[PDB]
Design a protein around this ligand. Structure first.
Ligand code: 948
Ligand code: OXL
Length: 780
């Protein structure tokens, strides 16, 4: 029995008193609200909110049976007796409390009939998680395939078909029950921790996500090199082996930006050395030279680190002496068994642990290390009587990796303020993206099932803040011999997902350079294609920094009024323009692609398809996976380079997919120095825009550049524009009012300024794109 007793406003927040205690409501923006129950009591702070203290001005009104607290899109409606808060966008009901808050921590809400619920972070259960119940406890799932209710990186959040996001702002061992136990009840639970939730609303999925990342944190632009080719295995055993691998990329003519070193960099065995956090000199005798020698070839070095210091490690006595480790309740360093051996866990929640760990990252970063891999932050083993500075293991568990990232991010920004940190981690919390976190999906099995789950995982993480979620390309766990077809399919799909990092246990090679002749002839041009497409990918990255828009988008974005599309986890958008359908079984001879209504082109073959709703059937081959381009797309390319350190946009090649069904289209290309964390804030960029206007008798392109530019920015780019599906009736072109004839022969064989290829239906324009506006007009 809960009822309203009294309220007041203090500092823009509404504090309500019931018979059971105090409740604080603060709008964190016009469409986001933090609801803190037990507000009177001391509890852990918010982890999910980028600005925990903020509270924007809201409107309060009172009636007999209700209060109403409104931010301008989001309204909280507070029923007095019995006490129940519900949430409205306009006057559409988003979400209503059932019994709401109780005791242990427990929140109960009604689900509407037909409401679909995405969320939970990494699970393999189906896109719509309604009807499921699962824990909120980050945990390894070694060798997963086609099913999981619990893995490395859960999120205590959901996204509904009613276009709200709900966050349980609580770091503790808990559970979510999405209308499983009771069909119309969403229940959130925890053993302890903060008793708060956050509701975010939107008028569309993009703007929900913009609103969500507004209050939880925007990912800062990673360094362009994170969009490149990684060499990684578990693991290079020696400096010789690592140098031989960088060399193999060179001698095999595969692009390579970054080599990743796993745990053998600090000791010769898997067990017993962890916490050394220093070079194993018997096997890495000259590491500063190694890294400098690699940097001369434009290659970065990334090192694995972990939260555990073993008692067998060289740093045990020192970590104990500095009070860097988590303690038992008695006050001693807590030691426990891990796979790796007997050890403790660095307390990133304390000042002492944070300083000690940070000093180590500083020193290695001074030596040459460009980036950082933080493995096992679930934490992988975390006994319940472990005590951190702010709470026990079960209370802080799901926020450990999150704070680890914060610690490392701040440290790297402090040491290198002119560089963008690279932080790759296995576990975090809502908002960990504001510390640069780049998550991967853990120890996936080397099976088709492992590959077939990657899109579901990626989309689930992308929707709730994590743009750079990716997989171990080719698969990681077990196997006894390479499954060549699965490997190829996985590295194909790789091109069209966020981070190009094949990784696997080293009894089978993960790196494409170590594959047979057929596999390399298939994958070499695709890895090059990933580099030629950097303008497309880096521009989606820019948009993610700006608005939260994930790089991978689900099919369901294509039609917000068709909730059945929510179930699709086999076709997705890579940026605005490409609909990708990975092949996830052996021997598949054709696919049916549920392309939205409109016009689509085969990316590889240029074939044009129109569809009014029905799916398209495309045949498959071993050299590609099915990718369709949306009519009206501008696909930008630069020439392939070995390393993003050599990246230039002096030469652009842009492909426009014309169709009269799209009378107006746009694209952009975001260019900056690829490394400056302040490029966007300070406008040190070159933002190229392109607008096509397509009428019955003309096709008009308007080109422009904004921003203040950056150092090394080309003033003039040689630009080849290729118009696919171009009309054969264009007689003339003018460029900024100057008329040029269109050639109809020998387009591939003359330095033609405008040439129509009648066999391919492509019109090619070659011109100089300088700083001033440019207008290209084709007319029949
Ligand atoms: O460090 C060894 C190895 C690493 O290669 C994987 O990527 C991790 O998820 C897991 N900890 C196991
Ligand atoms: O699209 C056009 O304008 C045509 O096909 O001739």
């Amino acid at each position: 029995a809960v009822f309203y007793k009294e309220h007041k406003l203090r500092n823009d927040g509404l504090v309500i008193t019931t018979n059971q205690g105090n409740i604080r409501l603060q709008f964190k923006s016009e469409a986001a609200i933090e609801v803190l129950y037990r507000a009177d009591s001391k509890q852990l702070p918010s982890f999910a909110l980028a600005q925990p203290e903020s509270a924007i001005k809201a409107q309060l009104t009172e009636t007999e049976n209700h209060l109403q607290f409104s931010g301008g899109t989001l309204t909280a409606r507070i029923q007095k007796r019995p006490f129940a808060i519900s949430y409205y966008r306009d006057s559409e009901l988003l979400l209503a409390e059932e019994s709401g808050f109780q005791v242990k921590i427990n929140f109960r809400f009604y689900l509407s009939p037909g409401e679909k619920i995405l969320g939970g972070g990494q699970r393999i259960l189906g896109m719509d998680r309604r009807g499921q119940r699962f824990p909120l406890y980050n945990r390894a799932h070694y060798g997963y395939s086609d099913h999981s209710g619990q893995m490395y990186f859960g999120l205590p959040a959901i996204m509904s078909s009613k276009q709200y996001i709900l966050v349980f702002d609580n770091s503790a061992s808990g559970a979510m029950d999405i209308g499983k136990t009771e069909s119309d009840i969403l229940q959130l639970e925890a053993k302890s921790g903060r008793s708060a939730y956050i509701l975010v609303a939107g008028n569309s999925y993009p703007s929900l996500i913009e609103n969500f990342t507004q209050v939880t944190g925007r990912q800062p632009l990673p360094p362009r090199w994170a969009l490149g080719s990684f060499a990684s295995r578990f693991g290079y055993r020696s400096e010789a082996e690592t140098r031989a691998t960088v060399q193999k990329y060179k001698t095999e003519d595969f692009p390579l930006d970054t080599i990743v070193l796993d745990l053998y960099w600090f000791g010769k065995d898997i067990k017993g050395h962890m916490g050394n956090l220093d070079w194993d000199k018997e096997n890495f005798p000259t590491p500063l030279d190694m890294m400098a020698d690699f940097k001369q070839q434009g290659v970065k070095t990334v090192l694995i680190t972990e939260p555990f210091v073993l008692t067998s490690s060289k740093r045990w006595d020192d970590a104990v002496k500095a009070k860097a480790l988590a303690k038992d309740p008695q006050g001693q360093p807590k030691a426990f068994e891990l796979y790796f051996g007997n050890g403790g866990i660095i307390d990133v929640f304390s000042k002492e642990g944070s300083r000690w760990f940070s000093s180590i990252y500083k020193d290695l970063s001074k030596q040459g290390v460009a980036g950082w891999w933080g493995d096992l932050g679930e934490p992988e083993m975390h006994p319940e009587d472990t005590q951190h500075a702010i709470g026990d293991a079960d209370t802080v568990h799901n926020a450990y990796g999150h704070r680890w990232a914060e610690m490392l991010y701040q440290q790297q920004l402090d040491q290198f303020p002119e560089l963008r940190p690279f932080i790759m981690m296995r576990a975090g919390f809502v908002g960990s993206q504001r510390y640069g976190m780049i998550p991967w999906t853990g120890d996936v099995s080397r099976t088709w099932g492992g590959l077939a789950s990657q899109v579901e995982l990626a989309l689930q993480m992308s929707l709730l803040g994590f743009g750079y979620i990716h997989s171990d390309l080719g698969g990681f766990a077990d196997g006894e011999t390479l499954d060549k077809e699965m490997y190829i399919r996985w590295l194909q799909y790789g091109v069209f997902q966020p981070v190009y990092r094949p990784h696997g246990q080293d009894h089978i090679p993960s790196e494409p350079v170590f594959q047979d002749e057929e596999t390399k002839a298939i994958l070499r041009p695709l890895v090059k294609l990933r580099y030629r497409m950097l303008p497309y990918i880096y521009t989606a990255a820019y948009q993610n920094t700006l608005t939260g828009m994930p790089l991978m988008r689900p099919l369901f974005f294509s039609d917000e009024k068709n909730p059945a599309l929510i179930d699709n986890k086999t076709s997705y958008f890579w940026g605005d323009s490409l609909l990708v359908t990975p092949i996830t079984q052996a021997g598949v001879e054709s696919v049916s692609i549920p392309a939205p209504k409109g016009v689509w082109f085969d990316f590889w073959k240029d074939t044009r398809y129109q569809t009014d709703g029905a799916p398209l059937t495309l045949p498959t081959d071993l050299h590609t996976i099915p990718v369709l381009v949306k009519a009206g797309a501008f696909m930008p390319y630069v020439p392939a380079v070995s390393t993003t350190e050599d990246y230039r946009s002096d030469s652009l090649e842009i492909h426009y997919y014309a169709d009269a069904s799209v009378p107006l289209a746009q694209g952009e290309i975001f260019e900056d120095d690829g490394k400056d964390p302040n490029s966007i804030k300070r406008n040190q960029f070159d933002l190229l825009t392109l607008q096509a206007t397509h009428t019955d008798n003309q096709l008009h392109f308007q080109l422009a550049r904004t921003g203040k530019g950056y150092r090394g920015m080309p003033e003039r780019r040689a630009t080849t524009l290729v118009i696919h599906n171009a009309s054969d009736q264009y007689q003339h072109l003018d460029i900024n009012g100057k008329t040029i004839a269109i050639a109809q022969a020998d387009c591939a064989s003359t330095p033609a300024l405008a040439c129509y290829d009648q066999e391919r239906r492509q019109l090619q324009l070659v011109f100089t794109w300088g700083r001033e506006a440019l207008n290209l007009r084709l007319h029949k």
